[PDB]
Amino acid sequence: VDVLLGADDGSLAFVPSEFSVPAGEKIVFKNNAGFPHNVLFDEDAVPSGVDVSKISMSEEDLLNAKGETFEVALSDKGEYTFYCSPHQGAGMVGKVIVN
């Protein structure tokens, strides 16, 4: 499933910013507008047993061009919060439910 980084109107949002996926389904974050963006998962808001380092970009890695992707597949069921490191303070955060 595809999640856009930035809305077409320049909003600092994941599109969609909440969704559910079955365990192990590929999630493709696709750079859209309003760069730079990246994608990390919050170590304080993922299921027990999840290592966010395996499913997160480096803070230093920034997506600066339209169409770049970051793909992950989440095996453990439960709720995950992801965020954009440059824009976390601007509310660029989302939630995926793995079921």
Give me the active site residues, please: 37, 84, 87, 92
> Collapsing DSSP states into helix, strand and coil, what is residue 29?
strand
87 binds Cu ion (CB under 5 A): yes
How are strands ordered across the β-sheet holding 40-41?
18-21, 93-98, 78-83, 40-41
**Alpha carbons 40 and 88: distance in angstroms, whole number:** 10
The residue from 39, 84, 96, 98 that contacts Cu ion (CB under 5 A) is: 84
Q: Is 95 annotated as a binding residue?
A: no
Shortest distance (Å) from residue 29 CB to Cu ion? 10
Binding site for Cu ion (CB under 5 A): 37, 84, 87, 92
